[PDB]
Design a protein around this ligand. Structure first.
Ligand SMILES: Nc1nc2c(ncn2[C@@H]2O[C@H](COP(=O)(O)OP(=O)(O)OP(=O)(O)O)[C@@H](O)[C@H]2O)c(=O)[nH]1
Ligand SMILES: [Mg+2]
Lengths: 141, 13, 163, 415
């Protein structure tokens, strides 16, 4: 998770400048091997998010997720479907086996003149006790 | 084939 | 080298001009139904001159020679006050084409023989040569049966080849 | 249901003849080509002709007319699918299929006609397994010929274990003269090149939308396959259940699957062309080519075919980047650009003349087709996730893939 340090304030700024509330197609980086976000690398990443900081207790959203996931794919080579969580009813538990963060619910001049949402929670047993599997048993066999 | 290959995983468990 | 066309009404002396420019004599010429060409060789430019007769059944076919044309000669008669209108019609009919857009104009006030014959100035304004657009038009009063002004139009024309 | 399948030439003489029922006379073939001269010159051309009660199912090769004749209410798609298969198997045997391929190699070709079909019933058409007892250089027929698995023989062994995949995009486009996209579907096709040991059962998984919907990952990147047509070797009953691409591949190069989908996003390259057709005079094509696709991606060796008039003459081309060749033989121009990245927009200004005499007849309006090729770039966004090598012996193969996006039918209707 070395080249994930150089965009650790840079992409998070674009996440935080993204509101939590041309181009066509998909390029693939040549000759770089691709793999999903594996278990021990998600253990390597959940501790990378535990140690580098700036993520815990932040306002999670989907626009921030997609800014983040494609940046992992283009700079680290990982399939950007790993940051998937359980839907609306219930705690937004990760479907990813190894992601130890569950999602609980919680510039300035773009406002007009007179005027006429989630967050992380570290759960180290989400890597072993797949709580999203308890929320979705029939999908995981 | 002048273009080069890229290796996929095997299992994706 | 220069592609030259001699357009105009019938009986314009345009074949009388052409054999005066090439040969130098006033040959007895029939009303020419088809066309004529003689490479007049004068002032470091060989003028390839496509004289074409100006009768009624020919005037639609005029469009076929309007390609790679570097210059016109629209011969008018100074002795045809009655035909200056259809000649003005002809001119405005013919010049308005995308083919033949970059060819300059040299008008001949032929048949300067009578008080019926006008000067260049009245003929210019009966034609309305000031109404022209994208034109190096230049009327040149000529006498075909005496060679007068003919080489002088060719003189002006040979200036107008290079830029 | 065939009775007599024949091969003709451009003249209509029989390159090779083979009956299967005797229910069609062998001299019926001599009426076909004049009827072919008849139906074409009246514009009543169909792939089926009829001289009385004999039905003339035919395809047309470069020189060849694979004429399959019948008389009854035969199954039609049974015929023609076999017809392209015979072309294919001959293409598998003879690297070009022409008159030289037939008259020099009648030793094997009549044997193929004996083997591929009996009575009108195709029974063995897999050429790769057919190589094992029908050679141009005889033993018993293989068990794979008897086997329900009819595409892959056992005991195939290599030193390495390489699975070479080619996820190939083919962008169709129909832009009218109005500038709107009429029909832009994408027919992608994954073609496999297998070099593996033994009898493996390969199990494939993609970023399928439905399979992610069955998983619960229908919020991430998932391609939506509107229809796929697969190989035989894919167990489609296993796929029908739960989107499971499970198969025993043949050995070598083969197309596994053929997906098709629509896409409501922009073309990768937008073309703006104009026509200053001056009557009897000239024509001008101030054509630009903007790239809408990704800037990291580069459209290799594009070949913009713009149909010019037939008697167009004196070509002039003010390009920006990329050369024009004028092809009067196709009455067109190929403004070719080798390297054309995404985001780039290159103009070309063409100028012809036109004869001061008009032509006699009309010409019609062919669209503009370009020949782009973008590697490492799935426009539909399809992603192979894995490839499960399952061998009873058990090995670690080398699965490999590259992504290439080309045109399908990239027609853009002109002025
Ligand atoms: N008096 C006088 N008559 C002229 C002069 N120029 C031409 N003409 C007369 O105009 C007539 C027409 O000249 P031609 O050249 O023979 O005929 P054209 O004008 O070429 O007409 P087409 O043969 O139909 O093209 C001639 O017969 C001459 O008599 C001139 O300068 N002075
Ligand atoms: Mg004359």
């Amino acid at each position: 998770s070395k080249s994930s340090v150089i965009g650790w304030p840079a992409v998070r700024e674009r996440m935080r400048r993204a509101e939590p509330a041309e181009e066509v197609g998909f390029p693939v980086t040549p000759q770089v091997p691709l793999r999903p976000m594996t278990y021990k690398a998600a253990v390597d990443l959940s501790h990378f998010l535990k140690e580098k900081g700036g993520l815990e207790g932040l306002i999670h959203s989907q626009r921030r997720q997609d800014i983040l996931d494609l940046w992992i794919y283009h700079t680290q080579g990982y399939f950007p479907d790993w940051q998937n969580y359980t839907p609306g009813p219930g705690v937004r538990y990760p479907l990813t086996f190894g992601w130890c963060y569950k999602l609980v619910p919680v510039k300035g001049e773009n406002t007009s003149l007179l005027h006429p949402v989630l967050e992380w929670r570290f759960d180290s047993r989400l890597a072993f006790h797949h709580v999203a599997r308890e929320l979705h048993p029939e999908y995981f066999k | 084939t002048s273009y080069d290959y890229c290796r996929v995983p095997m299992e994706d468990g | 080298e220069m592609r030259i066309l001699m357009v105009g009404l019938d009986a314009a002396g345009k074949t009388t001009i052409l054999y005066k420019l090439k040969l130098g004599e006033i040959v007895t010429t029939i009303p020419t139904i088809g066309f004529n060409v003689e490479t007049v060789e004068y002032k470091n430019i060989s003028f390839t001159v496509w004289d074409v007769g100006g009768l009624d059944k020919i005037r639609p076919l005029w469009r076929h020679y309007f390609q790679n044309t570097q210059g016109l000669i629209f011969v008018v008669d100074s002795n045809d006050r009655e035909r200056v209108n259809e000649a003005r019609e002809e001119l405005m009919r013919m010049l308005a084409e995308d083919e033949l857009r970059d060819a300059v104009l040299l008008v001949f006030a032929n048949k300067q023989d009578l008080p019926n014959a006008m000067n260049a100035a009245e003929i210019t304004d009966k034609l309305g040569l000031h109404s022209l657009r994208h034109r190096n038009w230049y009327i040149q009063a000529t006498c075909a049966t005496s060679g007068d002004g003919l080489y002088e139009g060719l003189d002006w024309l040979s200036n107008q080849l290079r830029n | 249901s065939a009775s007599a399948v024949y091969v003709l030439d451009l003249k209509g003489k029989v390159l090779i003849c083979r009956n299967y029922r005797g229910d069609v006379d062998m001299s019926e073939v001599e009426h076909f080509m004049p009827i072919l001269m008849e139906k074409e010159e009246e514009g009543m051309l169909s792939p089926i002709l009829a001289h009385g009660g004999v039905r003339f199912m035919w395809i047309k090769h470069n020189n060849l007319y694979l004429v399959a004749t019948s008389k009854k209410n035969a199954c039609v798609s049974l015929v023609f699918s076999f017809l392209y298969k015979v072309v294919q198997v001959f293409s598998e045997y003879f690297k070009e299929l022409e008159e030289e391929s037939i008259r020099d190699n009648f030793v094997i070709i009549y044997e193929l006609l004996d083997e591929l079909m009996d009575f009108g019933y195709p029974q063995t058409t897999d050429s790769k397994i057919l190589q094992e007892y029908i050679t141009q250089e005889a033993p018993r027929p293989p068990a794979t010929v008897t086997n329900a698995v009819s595409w892959r023989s056992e005991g195939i062994k290599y030193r390495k274990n390489e699975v070479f995949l080619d996820v190939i995009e083919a962008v169709n486009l129909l832009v009218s003269a109005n500038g709107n996209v009429l029909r832009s579907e994408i027919v992608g096709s994954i073609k496999m090149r297998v070099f593996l040991s033994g009898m493996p059962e390969l199990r494939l998984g993609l970023n399928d939308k439905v399979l992610f919907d069955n998983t619960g990952r229908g919020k991430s990147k998932s391609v939506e396959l509107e229809d796929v047509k697969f190989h035989q070797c894919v167990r489609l009953s296993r796929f029908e259940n739960d989107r499971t691409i499970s198969f025993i591949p043949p050995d070598g190069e083969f197309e596994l699957m053929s997906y098709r989908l629509n896409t409501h996003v922009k073309p990768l390259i937008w073309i703006e062309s104009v026509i200053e057709k001056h009557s009897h005079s000239r024509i001008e094509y101030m054509v630009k080519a903007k790239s809408q696709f990704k800037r990291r991606s580069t459209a290799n060796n594009v070949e913009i075919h713009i149909p010019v008039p037939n008697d167009a003459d004196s070509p002039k081309f003010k390009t920006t980047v990329g050369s024009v060749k004028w092809v009067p033989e196709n009455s067109e121009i190929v403004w070719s650009v080798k390297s054309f990245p995404g985001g780039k927009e290159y103009l070309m200004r063409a100028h012809f003349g036109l004869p001061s005499v008009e032509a006699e007849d009309k010409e019609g309006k062919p669209p503009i087709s370009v020949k782009f090729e973008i590697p490492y770039f799935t426009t539909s966004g399809i992603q192979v996730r894995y490839l499960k090598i399952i061998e009873k012996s058990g090995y670690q193969a080398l699965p490999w893939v590259r992504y290439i996006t080309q045109n399908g039918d990239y027609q853009l209707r002109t002025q």
